[PDB]
Write a protein that binds this ligand. Structure first.
Ligand SMILES: [Zn+2]
Ligand SMILES: [Zn+2]
Ligand SMILES: [Zn+2]
Ligand SMILES: [Zn+2]
Lengths: 83, 97, 119, 539, 107, 93, 99, 184, 681
């Protein structure tokens, strides 16, 4: 019930498509709370559309934690993960 | 899913599925509520129909996984510090004992 | 919230005051910078911790352990001597067991001359 | 509201509510829960404990448990598991602290053998004897006398010597002794079904009754094994008189305590119906027979197995003649010079037996003076209730319930016919009586299926319920009283720590008699209520 | 193991299973005619060894229970004559994806 | 009766315009409340003679075709008349 | 409130609701069936979970062990409705964090 | 004074992500503790050190991160019998409320071990001895013994002070006590 | 000072469902209800001192406070009370359960009447970890029924019999229960029946109009009898009877009423007084407020006066009244109501088990089915030039349709302005909420301007509905997995909802009367959720068929069929303006060589449609495709490719240039896998 070593990864390295969901939404609300963005931001705004622009650059410094049903945890960073 | 063709219609829906909330959310609400409370079912908070009642975050789907950010900092600065308040005055009581 | 250890390491002030002059030196460094609310403790920190030493050093702490490991002071007065009761007369035996009687003369006296090394 | 009565502390907890405070009033601490949880759920395992109590696993589990053992507060069973090894499941001794729950009254059990030395250091001697016993519960004159000084005539420092035997006192705990009775009967139910030499496979009756016979007669010498054993009684070393066996530890003998206090009741109830002359005669007569009569002990076998609506009588019949005949040899025929305070001619003076008539005794060997016995004690028990409700609630409840005794399931007209006063009162006394047990209710459908006001309302005794409700009494002070004793500890608990080690303040001086004579009120008040409780818990 | 012919008295069921270390297996003669296993619909079931079971749990890191089950005295299970907690690896060959398998336990 | 927490205006203006249906004072701009929570959809000698008294009362009343409302006036008067014991001594009519 | 006229609000029926589950949207439920629906915080007591008010656990009167949390007010409604009738769906709680 | 090993979780708002992690951590630590008094231990001085930083776990409803670490922080509980500087403060007669400036007022030494020969006179003197009175604000060596922690928060709907959470007590058991120039 | 205060974010683990104790009920309740109904009318309209409605128990309208917690309808959640109830009264909710809890216990010493090993046998069966729900129930039956066959209890020695739930289900007096001595086996010697005939013998003798005339009654257990009978259940079995005991709730006693808790006042809402003096009542409070009536009746009655015969019907009538209180079941079997009767049989006396049960009954449609704020409703109308993955939301609702916004950083130079317009004109906002979280600020007062000059970063403004926002969209009867589809919202004039017709087929909207359900979300993460998951383009295929549900219908199909048609042609002009009208502008293009030559120049539809797929060089949509559309006439079996046929043929396309065949549904029409769009996506 603890962290799995990065050496062994049993998972699909692709996105969850709920990856895109919570990664985006979370990053957004972060933007709404005024957190520093990691990308050049064009003349537009709002959290969501610029968050999309971030994941285009894959600059989100977050890790999806994943629960195997046995409670064996899991870790994947965005930069680790592939679209 | 358990031993036999069952379920669907309420009368088979008591099979495994243990959540008294939704068992009332379908049919025969009352006697499931009471008869539940009598037998003092320990229950659990699990399903969709479950977790929307109590309104906390859904188990599956978007919520099928927690989200984490890394602190990204080295344990080098996690080392303790002192001038050893304890160590220098240690050796007083160490004698005659 | 939760406490792993309450009674942990008995810690008096030596440079701990100066350590708050450090993080203080790190953050805003009092009103001496003229030449977060946190300063509320800082004045209170530096309040008494400064005066009795006048009415300080670093390596004296190392000089602290030198002849002082020889006594029965335990940790209690052994740490308490650093500040209170300038190791003189009845002050020093008023606390710890058998600082008089069993071991008295040289033990009570060295305290007077060793404290003169710092306080 | 506002906690002044605190129904919480009270209303919702039958039975074990006593126990879990008793042990608490004894120990509490680590020891509290294990008995409470036990009596609560019943059969329990060591491993099974800490998955409920969170009781400082396998230490206070082991510690409190062996604690109860030493004091025999648990019923104790072990057997191999069905795969192998061995497993241990646990029950609670009898009523357990029931032993403690008398104590000072068990101290009064001495007052029978208060005789032969009256108001001596011997009194204080046997006192510290008994309570030292009962604190541990199992000791030897080797262990006790070992702790005791060895410079005080052995046959005197420990003066109760041959007197160790008597009727009450002590019996070595052996095997079955604190072993759960209900099963150990089933343990004996083996070796009979288990030993069938493949005889005939027909009519389990021939298999059962015979096994029963064995199960019966084997069990007899089983429980007769503690009843007496000579190796204790007999020992007479060189240059000595008869002693007990100093070797094995012996334990408080609870039976003759039962029979003793039950006697005391009979002194009261008979004393009520007869005169102090005839009374005290009956009193001193019972002093001999209370030796031999089980009087609470007979159940035993009845407890632990289903009866049979005939075979139930097949137990009852055994109780009909048992004491009456063979212990009748031990019973009154001609007794000589019991005490006297009367004087001069003692013979027809002793014929005062025949003055015994109703509703008990007065059956003898048609020309020897004898009281019926094993028939006596049973139909005696049935009568014992009597007075129990008058200033309990109301005078008038007596005559109606008493009448409700003789008649059965009648009704209010035939009541008010037989009875007196006014419906205004008749309902009240009745209704205020129906508010708990007693009358119960009977009704029958009247020109309908079943309807609210059509039918007739009838009344019944059912002392089964009645004799079995007076435990609610147990749930009153034996429930509560112990608390306000304990609850008052934390009042002076600070002072209790100091005041106990002192031998100061005016209020201290005041609250001394307050809390203390207060303790007189509680404890004495308890034993008061106990003398009443001495019945419906057992017979 | 023995079979009935045409009557199965409940007195025989009152104590059917006398001897715990051994066991019994009961059927009606008319009931057993063409083996259910070989029929068509029931695909092949494979009883699996205890060490094999525990190994399977090593695979999916599954505790006990929490599996598809087989009601004790299922005729097919009776055909294999299982006992408590015993797991079968059942091979379904159906043309959808193709042949594959799953597991059940005897409850 | 209620007063703003800030501007402390003593007058509140209800806005039903946009169908927020809220309440705020022209002194602040800080609302009083959100979504005003609204609703939708024995035997005594006196009381019994009040039953019968309404029976008689109304019946004989609009026997004249008098307005129903007016009847409740007397109903109070009749009830008021019960207080002084003016009612008992004579006939009901 | 109900329908058009008096004032608005619109109907997510069960059959209407569950359509969102096929997309498995966690938060869309919450914002939709909770944060925008009945915004409420029940105050409870770890020991003997029950729903107090402000700073009390009432029946166990402590004013300490309470935890504040947000719940659909329809939920607490259903509770009191139950616990009106004799029944106890005592809410035991536990942390979100530290696993 | 001394040290303690304690654990907790801190909510880190997203803003400080630009700022140093551990520093903002410490910041919110003192924001939570600093002067604040911590029950059944004795008052927190401030954070001393920090350790076991772990990858922070946030909640869905928020999105502002949460990190539960432990650390050893400076608390104040020196020991029971002791002699230390301080002075009489708001007081009447029996016992005196001694204090060090700016720390807390809760130190109140009752009078039991304090010399039986004494006299109080409603005017500048708490008790004068056969050796005399003592002054406010003065550096004063006095003895402490006990501190008792209290919650005292039975907030009632009907209720709408008594905060002796960390409060020290003692008396003058020997010479030089209550006035430093008696010794010295 | 400053005691350290910590919090932990929490969440539910399960629910324990038990019954309260006797004490715990009143341990909750503030007041005894008691008193009588009246709502103490003097000085006021139901000033309701003590009584059923009590100001300290809760609040009803918005006037006064809750005493206990003042702050009235806003802050007070209500509180529970405690009805002292004369005599123990039975309980219907546990009735069918109570027959079982009593079913396995004797009436004599009242001990669990199965015993010994087998008792332990069931026990050891249960506590094994692998034992589960269906095993809980089924087992508890296998132990329960095992009792009935026992004719005789054990250390009581007395026999017993089965209890039948007396009478039928009319429920009138039916809640009374009856067992008895049974199985006479002809005539046997039964000390029960032996005495029994030795009992009636005298009362037979006294009133011989009755006994055999009405006989064979067996006997009951009174709720008063049975409360006793429960109390001597000795610990132990408990879970054997199915109740887990460990000194919390209170062993099988509670399940029959003793102190009925008063439902908290908010859940007993006093209906609007609705003008005048007579306020519209609320029902349950009328019920229990009669339960007080009959209560204090039987409390003052039975205390001094009345009679055993005039007694019960009050009391049995009471249990019918509380059973009636928590449920419908037995309704009015000509039993008539109590104080404030009527008696023309007012139908819906029922208030309670109903309000929790069906349809509009809460626990389905009012809780899982909540009717949710921030929405909108209108009829529809087509907008093809609106892109797919939008909905035209009319400005007039945008004015009242608002979205929560936490201003930050980048936001000001929009948001600082967006206020200056105010609620009136569309590109604006209305509500403001500062960083100091006071309450909120509604655009009503005035200012802005210098107000907006303040605008802390952590502030909050509620925008109107701006161009290309996040929205989710619905039709009334949820069919399948397309019930809700988000959209970037674009604002347009007039008033109605307008979507792109190609997405009709999921909604199967015929337009006409169809009224959609328009939603906007509030919290952020739900936005990115709906749009970037539940959104149109992502869901462009419907799952069940694995098919692209959304495509052109009707016009757009037949329209294509005309431009696609072989017999068509187009010239430099016609094609030009078309390729314009195909994407209104906005795009560079390239013209493939003309379909024909020296007899002028032209292009055919197959081309001009080919560009629709691949309009440009830089267009990443290189496609090959082939299939049968419908209305296909097979060629002569000679020609092997069906591509050359009588009518058109296989649609076939290579490198995203149409080779042969008209399109017409088929490729562009959903309805199949082989498709223009399905291939594309
Ligand atoms: Zn205002
Ligand atoms: Zn609580
Ligand atoms: Zn309130
Ligand atoms: Zn029985």
């Amino acid at each position: 019930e603890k962290a799995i070593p990065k050496d062994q990864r049993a998972t699909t390295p692709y996105m969850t498509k709920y990856e895109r969901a919570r990664i985006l939404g979370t990053r957004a609300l972060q933007i709404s709370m005024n957190a520093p963005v990691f990308v050049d931001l064009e003349g537009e705004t709002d959290p969501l559309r610029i968050a999309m622009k971030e994941l285009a650059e894959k600059k989100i410094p977050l890790v999806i934690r994943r629960y195997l049903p046995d409670g064996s945890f899991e870790d994947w960073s965005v930069e680790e993960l592939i679209v | 899913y358990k031993g036999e063709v069952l379920g669907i219609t309420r009368f088979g829906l008591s099979k495994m599925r243990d959540s008294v909330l939704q068992l009332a959310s379908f049919e025969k609400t009352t006697d499931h509520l009471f008869d539940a409370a009598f037998y003092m079912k320990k229950d659990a908070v699990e399903g969709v129909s479950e977790c929307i009642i109590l309104g906390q975050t859904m188990s599956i789907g978007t919520g099928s996984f927690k989200v984490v950010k890394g602190t990204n900092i080295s344990e080098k600065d996690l080392v303790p510090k002192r001038c050893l308040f304890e160590s220098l005055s240690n050796e007083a009581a160490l004698k005659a004992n | 919230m939760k406490v792993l250890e309450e009674r942990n390491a008995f810690l008096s002030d030596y440079e701990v005051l100066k350590f708050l002059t450090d993080l203080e030196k790190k953050h805003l460094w009092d009103q001496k910078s003229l030449a977060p609310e946190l300063q509320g403790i800082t004045r209170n920190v530096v309040n008494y911790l400064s005066i009795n030493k006048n009415f300080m050093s670093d390596e004296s702490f190392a000089e602290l352990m030198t002849k002082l490991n020889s006594f029965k002071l335990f940790k209690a007065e052994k740490l308490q001597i650093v500040n209170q009761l300038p190791a003189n007369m009845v002050h020093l035996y008023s606390i710890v067991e058998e600082c008089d009687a069993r071991f008295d003369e040289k033990t009570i006296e060295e305290m007077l001359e060793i404290i003169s090394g710092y306080a | 509201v506002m906690t002044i009565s605190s129904l919480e502390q009270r209303t919702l907890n039958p039975d074990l509510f006593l126990y879990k405070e008793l042990v608490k009033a004894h120990l509490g601490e680590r020891a509290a829960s294990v008995i409470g949880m036990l009596v609560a759920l019943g059969r329990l395992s060591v491993r099974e404990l800490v998955e409920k109590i969170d009781g400082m696993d396998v230490d206070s589990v082991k510690t409190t448990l062996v604690s109860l053992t030493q004091l025999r507060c648990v019923k104790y069973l072990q057997e191999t598991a069905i795969s192998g090894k061995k497993t241990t499941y646990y029950y609670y001794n009898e009523e357990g602290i029931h032993i403690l729950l008398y104590s000072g009254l068990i101290i009064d059990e001495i007052i029978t053998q208060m005789r032969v030395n009256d108001e001596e250091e011997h009194k204080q001697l046997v006192a510290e004897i008994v309570q030292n016993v009962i604190s541990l519960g199992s000791l030897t004159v080797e262990d006790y006398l070992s702790s005791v000084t060895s410079d005080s005539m052995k046959y005197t420092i420990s003066s109760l010597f041959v007197q160790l035997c008597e009727m009450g006192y002590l019996i070595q705990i052996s095997k079955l002794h604190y072993t759960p009775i209900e099963d150990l009967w089933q343990f004996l139910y083996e070796k009979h079904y288990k030993n069938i030499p493949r005889n005939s496979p027909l009519s389990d009756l021939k298999k059962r009754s015979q096994a029963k016979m064995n199960a019966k007669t084997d069990f007899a010498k089983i429980i007769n094994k503690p009843n007496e054993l000579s190796q204790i009684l007999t020992v007479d070393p060189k240059t000595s008189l008869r002693i007990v066996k100093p070797t094995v530890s012996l334990t408080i003998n609870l039976d003759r305590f039962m029979k003793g206090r039950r006697s005391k009741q009979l002194i009261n109830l008979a004393k009520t119906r007869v005169g102090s002359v005839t009374a005290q005669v009956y009193k001193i007569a019972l002093r001999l027979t209370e030796q031999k009569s089980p009087k609470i002990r007979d159940p035993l076998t009845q407890t632990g197995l289903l009866q049979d609506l005939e075979e139930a009588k097949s137990f009852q019949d055994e109780a009909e003649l048992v004491e009456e005949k063979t212990p009748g040899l031990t019973f009154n025929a001609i007794d000589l010079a019991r005490h006297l305070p009367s004087a001069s001619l003692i013979n027809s003076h002793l014929k005062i037996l025949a003055s015994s008539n109703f509703p008990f005794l007065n059956e003898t060997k048609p020309g020897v003076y004898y009281v019926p016995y094993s028939k006596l004690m049973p139909v005696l028990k049935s009568s014992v209730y009597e007075y129990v409700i008058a200033s309990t609630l109301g005078p008038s409840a007596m005559r109606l319930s008493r009448c409700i005794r003789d008649n059965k399931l009648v009704s209010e007209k035939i009541i008010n016919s037989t009875a007196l006063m006014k419906e205004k009162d008749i309902r009240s006394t009745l209704a205020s009586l129906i508010r708990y047990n007693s009358v119960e209710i009977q009704e029958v459908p009247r020109t309908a299926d079943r309807s609210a006001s059509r039918a007739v309302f009838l009344f019944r005794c059912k002392e089964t319920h009645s004799y079995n409700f007076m435990r609610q009494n147990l749930e009153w002070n034996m429930a509560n009283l112990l608390f306000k004793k304990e609850k008052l500890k934390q009042e002076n608990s600070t002072l209790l720590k100091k005041a106990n080690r002192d031998d100061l303040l005016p209020s201290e001086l005041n609250q001394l008699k307050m809390v203390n004579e207060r303790e007189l009120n509680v404890f004495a008040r308890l034993s008061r209520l106990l003398s009443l409780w001495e019945v419906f818990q057992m017979a | 193991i023995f079979v009935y012919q045409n009557n199965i008295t409940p007195s025989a069921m009152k104590l059917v299973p006398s001897i715990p270390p051994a066991t019994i297996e009961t059927f009606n003669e008319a009931a057993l005619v063409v083996n259910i296993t070989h029929h068509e619909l029931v695909p092949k079931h494979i009883r699996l060894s205890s060490d094999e079971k525990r190994e399977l749990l090593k695979r999916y890191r599954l505790k006990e229970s929490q599996l598809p089950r087989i009601q004790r005295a299922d005729p097919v299970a009776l055909y294999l004559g299982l006992k408590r907690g015993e797991v079968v690896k059942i091979i379904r060959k159906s043309e959808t994806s193709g042949r594959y398998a799953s597991y059940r336990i005897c409850m | 009766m209620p007063v703003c927490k800030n501007c402390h205006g003593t007058e509140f203006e209800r806005d039903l315009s946009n169908a927020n249906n809220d309440l705020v004072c022209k002194a602040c701009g800080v609302v009083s409340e959100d979504n005003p929570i609204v609703s939708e959809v024995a035997l005594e000698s006196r009381e019994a003679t009040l039953n019968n008294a309404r029976r008689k009362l109304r019946a004989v009343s609009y026997a004249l075709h008098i307005p129903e409302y007016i009847t409740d006036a007397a109903f109070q008067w009749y009830k008021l008349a019960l207080a002084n014991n003016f009612v008992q001594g004579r006939r009901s009519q | 409130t109900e329908g058009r006229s008096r004032d608005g609000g619109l109907r997510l029926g069960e059959m209407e609701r569950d359509c969102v589950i096929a997309y498995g949207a966690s938060q869309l439920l919450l914002e939709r069936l909770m944060i925008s629906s009945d915004a409420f915080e029940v105050d409870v007591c770890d020991k003997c979970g029950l729903m107090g008010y402000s700073g009390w656990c009432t029946t166990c009167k402590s004013a300490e062990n309470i935890i504040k949390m947000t719940i659909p007010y329809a939920a607490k409604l259903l509770f009191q409705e139950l616990l009106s009738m004799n029944i106890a769906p005592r809410l035991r709680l536990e942390d979100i964090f530290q696993q | 004074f001394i040290l303690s090993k304690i654990a907790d979780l801190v909510r880190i708002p997203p803003d400080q992500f630009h700022r140093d992690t551990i520093s903002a951590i410490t910041h919110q630590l003192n924001n939570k503790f600093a002067n604040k008094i911590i029950p059944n231990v004795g008052l927190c001085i401030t954070i001393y050190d920090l350790l076991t930083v772990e990858e922070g776990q946030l909640k869905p409803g928020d999105g502002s991160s949460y990190i539960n670490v432990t650390f050893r922080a400076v608390v104040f509980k020196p020991f029971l019998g002791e002699i230390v500087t301080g002075w009489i403060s708001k007081c009447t007669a029996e016992g005196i409320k001694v204090s060090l400036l700016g720390i807390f007022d809760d130190i109140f030494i009752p009078q039991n071990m304090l010399f039986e020969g004494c006299y109080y006179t409603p005017e500048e003197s708490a008790w004068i001895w056969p050796k005399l009175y003592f002054d406010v604000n003065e550096k004063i060596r006095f003895r402490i013994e006990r501190e008792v922690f209290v919650d005292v928060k039975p907030k009632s709907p009907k209720e709408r002070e008594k905060p002796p959470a960390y409060a020290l007590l003692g008396s003058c058991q020997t010479d030089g006590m209550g006035l430093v120039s008696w010794w010295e | 000072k400053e005691v350290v205060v910590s919090e932990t974010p929490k969440r539910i683990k399960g629910l324990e469902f038990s019954a309260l104790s006797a004490a715990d009920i009143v341990a909750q309740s503030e007041v005894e209800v008691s008193t009588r109904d009246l709502f103490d009318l003097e000085k006021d309209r139901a000033p309701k001192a003590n009584g059923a409605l009590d100001p300290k128990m809760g609040v009803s309208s918005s006037s006064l406070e809750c005493a206990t917690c003042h702050g009235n309808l806003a802050s007070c959640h209500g509180h529970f009370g405690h009805l002292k109830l004369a005599l123990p009264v039975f309980h219907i909710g546990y009735f069918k359960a109570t027959i079982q809890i009593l079913q396995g216990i004797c009436k004599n010493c009242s001990a669990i009447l199965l015993s010994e090993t087998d008792k332990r046998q069931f026990l050891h069966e249960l506590r094994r970890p692998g034992v589960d729900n269906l095993r809980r129930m089924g087992i508890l039956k296998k132990i329960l029924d095992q009792c009935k066959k026992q004719r005789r209890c054990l250390h009581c020695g007395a026999l017993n019999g089965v209890v039948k739930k007396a009478a039928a289900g009319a429920g009138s007096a039916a809640l009374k229960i009856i067992h008895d001595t049974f199985r006479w086996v002809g005539k046997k010697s039964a000390p029960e029946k032996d005495i029994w005939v030795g009992e009636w013998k005298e009362v037979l003798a006294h009133n011989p109009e009755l006994e055999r005339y009405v006989k064979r009654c067996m006997d009951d257990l009174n709720p008063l009898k049975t409360l006793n009978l429960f109390k001597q259940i000795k610990s132990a079995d408990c879970e054997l009877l199915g109740i887990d005991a460990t000194v919390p709730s209170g062993r099988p006693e509670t399940y029959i009423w003793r102190y009925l808790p008063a439902p908290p006042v908010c859940i007993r809402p006093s209906v609007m007084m609705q003008d005048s003096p007579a306020s519209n009542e609320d029902d349950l409070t009328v019920k229990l407020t009669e339960i007080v009536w009959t209560s204090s009746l039987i409390k003052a009655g039975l205390d001094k006066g009345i009679s055993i015969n005039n007694m019960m019907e009050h009391w049995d009538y009471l249990q019918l009244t509380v059973a009636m209180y928590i449920n419908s079941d037995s309704v009015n079997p000509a039993m008539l109501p109590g104080s404030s009767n009527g008696g023309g049989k007012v139908k819906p006396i029922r208030g309670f088990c109903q309000r929790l049960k069906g349809k509009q009954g809460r626990f389905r449609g009012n809780l899982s089915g909540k009717r949710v704020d921030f929405s909108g409703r209108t009829v529809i109308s087509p907008d093809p030039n609106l892109s797919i993955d939008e909905v035209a939301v009319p400005d007039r609702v945008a004015k009242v349709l608002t979205y929560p916004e936490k201003v930050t950083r980048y936001n000001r130079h929009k948001l600082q302005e967006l206020i200056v317009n105010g609620p009136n004109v569309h590109p604006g906002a209305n509500y403001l909420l500062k960083r100091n979280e006071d309450a909120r600020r509604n655009l009503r007062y005035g200012d802005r301007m210098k107000l907006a000059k303040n605008l802390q970063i952590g502030d909050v403004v509620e925008r109107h509905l701006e161009d290309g926002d996040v929205v989710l969209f619905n039709r009334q009867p949820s069919l399948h997995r397309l019930s809700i589809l988000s959209h970037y919202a674009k604002i347009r004039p007039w008033r109605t909802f307008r979507l792109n017709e190609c997405v009709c087929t999921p909604y199967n909207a015929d337009f006409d009367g169809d009224e959609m359900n328009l939603h906007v979300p509030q919290t952020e993460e739900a936005r990115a959720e709906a749009i970037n998951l539940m959104g149109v383009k992502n869901n462009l295929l419907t799952p069940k068929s694995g098919e692209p549900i959304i495509a052109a219908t009707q016009d757009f199909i037949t329209g294509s069929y005309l431009i696609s048609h072989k017999d068509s042609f187009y010239d430099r002009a016609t094609l030009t303006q078309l390729l314009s009208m195909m994407s209104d502008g906005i795009e560079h293009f390239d013209i493939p060589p003309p379909a024909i030559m020296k007899p002028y120049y032209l292009w055919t539809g197959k081309q001009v449609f080919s560009l629709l797929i691949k309009p440009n060089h830089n267009s990443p949509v290189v496609i090959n495709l082939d299939a049968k559309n419908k209305v296909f006439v097979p060629p002569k079996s000679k020609s092997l490719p069906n591509e050359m046929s009588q009518n058109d043929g296989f649609v076939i396309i290579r490198g995203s240039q149409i080779l042969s065949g008209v399109m017409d549904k088929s490729v562009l029409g959903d309805g199949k896998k082989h498709s223009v769009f399905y291939t594309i996506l």
